[PDB]
């Protein structure tokens, strides 16, 4: 995944979730979209 | 009117019957023939005329050849030899390019005895007006 | 809450036993017991279970709804039972079941004996098709994901163990 | 039609008008006519949404102060420099 300060929805299939204390992007349609550390 | 099982559409003109260069190998590659395209093809292609692009059904199950009942020609096929340019577009909307009219293509479209929508023939009338405008033409309606 | 508020109905002779936060739910096909949060309160009456917040707990409703939707599927459990099905894709990939064990042949040096737990059981219409069956929704869940784990579908062929409820997009390969 | 409630001003100066704005209110004034001008306080949230509609600035408004009906027109307004908020308003008795 990509990790950076500004994470974002990139597809309409992106989803933002918090897990532990950490902003993540789970896209159901494009592995490249997975982000962490927002 | 049932579901999926045989149909393509990739030709040039009733003039050419079965050709190899613009098409050829894939004019039959699954239950259809590169050789059979004058038999059911010219079962009424020459009887009437050879000079208007027309594609058709394929209907395939497992019976040797194929039962494709044929039908109509497009509406920009009648913009070369019944209305104007053989090519068309050019610079489609840099100016009016070419031009048609209401008389021009009324009967040329009113013909189809096997296609079009709505028994009102003032409606499917104009259904064809725009396939002379997908190229950017003027309205002398 | 839309979930928690929505009641759940204990069918024919499903015996239900609450003991504080401790629910038991037995029926035709098993018996499961769970422990509910604490900020959940559950009321048993008629042939229905209901759920609702508990005075002075922030998460009240959410805890209720998750509890709600759990007991529901506990009940489905001892009754219709759940069933996950996996199929095995790839030359040589076969599988079958000695007792409570599934013998998996998934291209490794050593085939794989996967032990089945508490309350799940399996069989194999085919050399290439596994089907788990049990009352515990969250356990056939794991087992399914575990048999899966041995060989997650790969993206250039779909070779691998997959749920049947699973689409497996594949891709090309880079040019040269 | 546009009805604006408003009590007159017990005090004046900046310390006083800053306090005013500190507690979601803001001051305005009324003048013209032969009357002495009247210093006022308007509630902020309410007059804000009024003026969002461009008839606020065109139409004659009716200011209600101590159960009396003053008819006026928006004459000027001072806006906070970068927040969407009013600082002060000039109403003209007309």
């Amino acid at each position: 995944m990509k990790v950076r300060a500004s994470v974002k929805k990139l597809c309409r299939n992106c989803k933002i979730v918090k897990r532990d204390g950490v902003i993540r992007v789970i896209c159901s349609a494009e592995p490249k979209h997975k982000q962490r550390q927002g | 009117a049932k579901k999926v099982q045989a149909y393509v559409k990739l030709q040039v003109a009733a003039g050419m019957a079965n050709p190899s260069p613009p098409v050829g190998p894939a004019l039959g590659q699954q239950g259809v023939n590169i050789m059979e395209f004058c038999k059911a093809f010219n079962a009424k292609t020459d009887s009437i005329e050879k000079g208007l692009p027309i594609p058709v059904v394929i209907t395939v199950y497992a019976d040797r050849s194929f039962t494709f009942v044929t039908k109509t020609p497009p509406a920009a096929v009648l913009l070369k030899k019944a209305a104007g340019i053989k090519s068309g577009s050019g610079k489609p909307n840099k100016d009016k390019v070419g031009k048609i009219s209401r008389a021009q293509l009324q009967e040329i479209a009113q013909t189809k005895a096997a296609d079009m929508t709505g028994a009102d023939i003032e409606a499917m009338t104009r259904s064809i007006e725009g396939t002379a405008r997908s190229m950017g033409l003027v309205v002398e309606d | 809450s839309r979930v928690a508020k929505a009641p759940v109905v204990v069918p024919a002779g499903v015996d239900v036993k609450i003991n504080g936060q401790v629910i038991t739910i037995k029926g035709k096909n098993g018996e499961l017991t769970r422990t509910l949060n604490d900020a959940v309160e559950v009321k048993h009456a008629d042939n229905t279970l209901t759920f609702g917040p508990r005075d002075g707990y922030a998460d009240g409703w959410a805890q209720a709804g998750t509890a709600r939707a759990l007991l529901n599927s506990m009940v489905i459990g001892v009754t219709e039972g759940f069933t996950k099905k996996l199929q095995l894709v790839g030359v040589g990939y076969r599988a079958a079941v000695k007792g409570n064990v599934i013998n998996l042949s998934l291209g490794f040096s050593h085939p794989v004996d996967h032990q089945l737990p508490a309350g799940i059981t399996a069989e194999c219409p085919t050399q290439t098709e596994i089907v788990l069956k049990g009352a515990d929704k969250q356990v056939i869940g794991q087992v399914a994901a575990d048999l899966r784990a041995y060989r997650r579908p790969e993206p250039y062929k779909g070779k691998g163990v997959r749920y049947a409820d699973e689409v497996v997009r594949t891709k090309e390969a880079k040019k040269k | 039609m546009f009805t604006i409630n408003a009590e007159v001003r017990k005090e004046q100066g900046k310390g006083a008008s800053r306090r005013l704005r500190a507690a979601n209110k803001f001051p305005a004034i009324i003048y013209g006519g032969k009357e002495a001008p009247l210093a006022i306080e308007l509630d902020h949230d309410k007059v804000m949404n009024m003026q969002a509609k461009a008839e606020f600035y065109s139409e004659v408004l009716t200011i209600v102060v101590d159960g009396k009906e003053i008819k006026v027109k928006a004459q000027d307004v001072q806006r906070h420099p970068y927040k969407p908020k009013l600082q002060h308003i000039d109403f003209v008795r007309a």
Partner: protein
């Protein structure tokens, strides 16, 4: 890039940038990009952003720039003592107070203006905000 074409003098005193801003109303177009913060803009900054907004509306509409350098900035370079005369100019900036309208635009759907004004902001050292035109 912007900068005086000629100036009565070559260098200015450091100055101070206290204060609230003097051009606060979208007064030429339909939408301004306004400064919520205090600080300095540089001709390059003004410019980098200027391009950004123009990029975004292709060749449509009109744009104004309400701010402008005129304040020259010096710098001593490496390996130099303190002193021995004021530095050499090197760029120009425009002192910004909060509430300056920075850019205006007009001739586009409000939405696109936002879009452009957004992308431009990204190049500016100070926080900004999308304002609209007002009767009075």
């Amino acid at each position: 890039m912007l900068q005086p074409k000629r100036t009565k003098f070559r260098k200015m005193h450091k100055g101070r940038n206290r204060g609230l801003a003097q051009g606060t109303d979208v007064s030429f177009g339909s939408f301004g990009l306004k400064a919520v913060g205090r600080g300095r803009l540089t001709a390059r900054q003004i410019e980098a952003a200027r391009r950004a907004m123009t990029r975004a509306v292709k060749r449509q509409g009109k744009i104004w720039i309400r701010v402008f350098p005129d304040k020259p900035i010096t710098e001593k370079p490496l390996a130099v003592r303190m002193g021995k005369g004021k530095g050499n100019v090197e760029y120009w900036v425009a002192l910004i107070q909060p509430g300056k309208v920075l850019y205006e635009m007009d001739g586009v759907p409000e939405e696109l203006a936002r879009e452009a004004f957004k992308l431009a902001a990204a190049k500016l050292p100070i926080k900004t905000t999308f304002v609209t035109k007002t009767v009075m």
